[PDB]
Amino acid sequence: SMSYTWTGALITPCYATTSRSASLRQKKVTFDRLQVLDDHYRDVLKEMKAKASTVKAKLLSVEEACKLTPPHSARSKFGYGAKDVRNLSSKAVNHIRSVWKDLLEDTETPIDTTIMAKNEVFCVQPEKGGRKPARLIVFPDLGVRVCEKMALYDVVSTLPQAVMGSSYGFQYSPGQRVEFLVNAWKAKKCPMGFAYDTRCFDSTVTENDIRVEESIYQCCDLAPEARQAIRSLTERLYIGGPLTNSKGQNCGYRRCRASGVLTTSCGNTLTCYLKAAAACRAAKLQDCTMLVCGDDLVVICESAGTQEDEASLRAFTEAMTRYSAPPGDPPKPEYDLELITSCSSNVSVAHDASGKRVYYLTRDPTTPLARAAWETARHTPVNSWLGNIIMYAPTLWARMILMTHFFSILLAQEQLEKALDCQIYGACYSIEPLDLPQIIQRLHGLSAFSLHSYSPGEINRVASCLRKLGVPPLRVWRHRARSVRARLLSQGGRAATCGKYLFNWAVRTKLKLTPIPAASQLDLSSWFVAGYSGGDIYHSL
Numbered sequence: 001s002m003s004y005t006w007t008g009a010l011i012t013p014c015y016a017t018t019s020r021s022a023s024l025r026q027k028k029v030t031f032d033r034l035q036v037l038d039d040h041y042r043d044v045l046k047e048m049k050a051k052a053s054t055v056k057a058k059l060l061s062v063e064e065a066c067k068l069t070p071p072h073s074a075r076s077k078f079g080y081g082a083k084d085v086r087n088l089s090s091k092a093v094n095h096i097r098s099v100w101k102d103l104l105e106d107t108e109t110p111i112d113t114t115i116m117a118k119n120e121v122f123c124v125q126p127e128k129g130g131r132k133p134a135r136l137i138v139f140p141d142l143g144v145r146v147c148e149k150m151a152l153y154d155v156v157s158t159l160p161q162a163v164m165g166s167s168y169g170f171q172y173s174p175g176q177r178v179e180f181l182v183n184a185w186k187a188k189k190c191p192m193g194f195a196y197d198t199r200c201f202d203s204t205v206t207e208n209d210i211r212v213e214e215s216i217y218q219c220c221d222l223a224p225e226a227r228q229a230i231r232s233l234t235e236r237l238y239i240g241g242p243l244t245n246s247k248g249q250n251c252g253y254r255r256c257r258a259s260g261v262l263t264t265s266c267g268n269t270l271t272c273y274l275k276a277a278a279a280c281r282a283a284k285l286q287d288c289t290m291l292v293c294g295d296d297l298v299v300i301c302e303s304a305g306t307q308e309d310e311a312s313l314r315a316f317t318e319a320m321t322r323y324s325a326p327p328g329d330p331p332k333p334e335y336d337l338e339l340i341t342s343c344s345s346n347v348s349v350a351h352d353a354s355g356k357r358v359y360y361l362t363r364d365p366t367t368p369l370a371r372a373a374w375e376t377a378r379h380t381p382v383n384s385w386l387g388n389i390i391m392y393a394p395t396l397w398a399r400m401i402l403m404t405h406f407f408s409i410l411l412a413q414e415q416l417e418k419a420l421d422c423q424i425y426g427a428c429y430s431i432e433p434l435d436l437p438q439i440i441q442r443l444h445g446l447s448a449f450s451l452h453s454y455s456p457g458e459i460n461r462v463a464s465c466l467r468k469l470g471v472p473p474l475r476v477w478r479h480r481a482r483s484v485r486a487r488l489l490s491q492g493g494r495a496a497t498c499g500k501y502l503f504n505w506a507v508r509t510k511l512k513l514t515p516i517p518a519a520s521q522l523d524l525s526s527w528f529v530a531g532y533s534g535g536d537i538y539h540s541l
């Protein structure tokens with residue numbers, strides 16, 4: 001079947017990516033899928049199902065599901081918004097209960113979805129190509145989204161880890177991800193690793209893939225209504241349905257993965273894992289270790305030789321193609337762990353204050369800096385700079401540029417204590433910047449404040465990026481951080497801790513740094529459990 005069918009009605013509005021480029025994306029994501037399954041696929045599936053069998057999932061109440069709704073989640077077309085949902089307003093609640101009742105009674109009628117072009121900031125690079133088309137987002141109404149949580153929130157939070165174990169990427173903090181990859185690399189006699197990039201993964205997801213995914217969810221111990229709701233949501237929403245633009249016009253139909261449903265991340269991880277594990281067997285890759293985050297796949301295995309490794313990747317690719325997961329860029333074997341870019345990141349190493357080696361995750365800073373520049377220029381709902389400070393806290397660029405720039409703005413605006421929204425693995429977190437030292441200590445360890453001896457390649461990538469973007473050099477940032485640090489120190493409490501810990505790299509004579517006592521009190525239990533991209537998930541912490 002066709003991933004999409006279109007009426008010709010435009011994807012209407014609600015460098016930055018806009019609805020103008022939607023037509024270019026539509027051409028790429030629109031194709032017929034030809035999927036051929038074999039015994040390797042069937043074997044891996046049965047193994048996954050046996051692990052899913054151990055899961056017991058709870059049905060969330062309306063109230064618990066309402067509490068997970070982001071405050072700025074798109075309003076319902078039925079006369080209520082995200083604020084009404086969170087406040088448990090009679091109208092919102094009554095509508096949610098009728099949506100739920102309808103899921104239990106109607107097992108066939110397709111549910112309507114809205115299609116929108118996503119507005120994302122990318123860097124204006126005229127040397128290696130041109131502007132990227134806007135990504136497309138497909139999501140059901142707010143009432144349906146609350147119902148999805150009731151039936152599947154506990155499933156999507158618990159099941160992926162039970163099924164995939166250590167291969168489930170979203171259970172890891174950046175430090176644990178680094179440790180997993182380093183351990184996997186070290187465990188091989190002669191390691192070889194590769195990233196597998198699927199061309200438009202969401203469009204490659206077939207109706208059968210979605211039913212196979214349900215077959216895995218159905219192995220859980222579930223309440224009868226949860227079981228019916230999962231069955232109904234699969235047929236009416238997950239497998240496909242009609243697409244409506246922002247103007248309420250019929251845009252066409254979808255027969256592939258919707259990017260804005262609760263099961264997107266979980267389903268994509270399960271599907272990518274299933275296909276990859278089966279393709280590993282077809283390719284005869286030896287002693288495979290996989291790390292899967294949605295459509296992002298990394299494989300670490302035993303090298304069989306240079307030519308043999310090239311042949312085994314072509315074989316893996318041919319198998320993924322048969323399973324309807326063809327490649328964007330063909331995979332390349334790597335013989336150094338640092339050379340693998342997975343989840344847009346690479347492993348790097350630094351030294352702590354005692355000279356001990358510390359592995360950390362980094363990435364090219366172009367996109368994070370350009371997005372930070374967009375956010376500094378215009379008020380945004382999500383602060384990517386805050387997410388990048390949290391996730392890339394040990395990096396040279398996040399410490400010297402992002403922390404220095406944003407802490408000077410927060411000092412000037414006197415908004416250090418004001419909670420900000422940021423995204424962590426697709427979920428929305430409301431965070432006070434004053435809590436950053438505690439968060440960083442918990443996710444990366446005390447050493448994240450004392451790291452030095454950065455690699456020449458990492459130093460050069462940062463410095464070249466600053467030049468290209470017209471950002472002042474690192475020496476200017478050191479000078480700026482000293483003033484930012486001094487002002488934070490003068491304020492006391494958490495503000496002084498931000499100065500002392502985040503800006504210890506800036507001082508002539510570096511301070512001792514003892515663990516932050518209150519850091520253990522932060523409840524980070526919901527943090528690196530699961531991925532919720534497009535899942536409409538929220539938490540205050």
Ligand SMILES: O=C(O)/C=C/c1ccc(NC(=O)C2(NC(=O)c3ccc4c(C5CCCCC5)c5n(c4c3)CC(=O)Nc3ccccc3-5)CCCC2)cc1
Nearest residue numbers: 369370371372373374376401402405469470471472473476
């Ligand atoms: O001695 C030497 O060798 C050179 C010294 C030197 C060179 C340049 C400056 N720049 C400045 O003073 C100003 N900009 C900045 O002090 C500045 C700060 C952050 C900037 C950012 C980001 C960095 C990440 C957080 C958000 C802001 C960008 N750009 C920035 C410029 C350059 C810019 O203007 N825009 C972009 C565009 C894309 C990406 C980054 C940038 C402020 C007044 C006039 C311009 C200062 C000192």
